[PDB]
């Protein structure tokens, strides 16, 4: 049922490393958020 | 509440030997864990001599 990957030790057949980011957006409360740049405080100014 | 498990606590040195002393104090917020499960039953872990 399963065959081996004939990866020879030597470009379409080249080994591409692939990462899939599957995002679960409802199974839990929010947990991962992108960081964002802050800004300096200024006093006595609207 | 709504998938947030809130733990409150406060520690106080007391004299009364068995029961709550007459008095008042408030419990601190500590942590509010993002714990997304249901709870309806529970148990206490204890130390055994």
Swiss-Prot record, chain A:
Impact after mutating residue 3 to R: In strain: Omicron/BA.1, Omicron/BA.2, Omicron/BA.2.12.1
Result after altering residue 6 to S: In strain: Omicron/BA.1
Region named Disordered: 27-46
Superkingdom: Viruses
Reported effect, residue 13 to H: In strain: Omicron/BA.1, Omicron/BA.2, Omicron/BA.2.12.1, Omicron/BA.2.75, Omicron/BA.4, Omicron/BA.5, Omicron/BQ.1.1, Omicron/XBB.1.5, Omicron/EG.5.1
Role of this protein: Attaches the virion to the cell membrane by interacting with host receptor, initiating the infection. The major receptor is host ACE2. When S2/S2' has been cleaved, binding to the receptor triggers direct fusion at the cell membrane. When S2/S2' has not been cleaved, binding to the receptor results in internalization of the virus by endocytosis using host TFRC and GRM2 and leading to fusion of the virion membrane with the host endosomal membrane. Alternatively, may use NRP1/NRP2 and integrin as entry receptors.
Subunit structure: Binds to host ACE2. RBD also interacts with the N-linked glycan on 'Asn-90' of ACE2. Cleavage of S generates a polybasic C-terminal sequence on S1 that binds to host Neuropilin-1 (NRP1) and Neuropilin-2 (NRP2) receptors. Interacts with host integrin alpha-5/beta-1 (ITGA5:ITGB1) and with ACE2 in complex with integrin alpha-5/beta-1 (ITGA5:ITGB1). May interact via cytoplasmic c-terminus with M protein. May interact (via N-terminus) with host bilirubin and biliverdin, thereby preventing antibody binding to the SARS-CoV-2 spike NTD via an allosteric mechanism.
Protein name: Spike protein S1
Species annotation: Severe acute respiratory syndrome coronavirus 2
Gene that encodes the chain: S
């Amino acid at each position: 049922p399963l065959q081996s990957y004939g990866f020879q030790p030597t470009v379409g057949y080249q080994p591409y490393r692939v990462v899939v980011l599957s995002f679960e957006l409802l199974h839990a409360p929010a947990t991962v958020c992108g960081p964002k740049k802050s800004t300096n405080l200024v006093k006595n100014k609207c | 509440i709504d998938g947030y498990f809130k733990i409150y606590s406060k520690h106080t040195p007391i004299n009364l030997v068995r029961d709550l002393p007459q008095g008042f104090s408030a419990l601190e917020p500590l942590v509010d864990l993002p714990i997304g499960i249901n709870i309806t039953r529970f148990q206490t872990l204890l130390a055994l001599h």
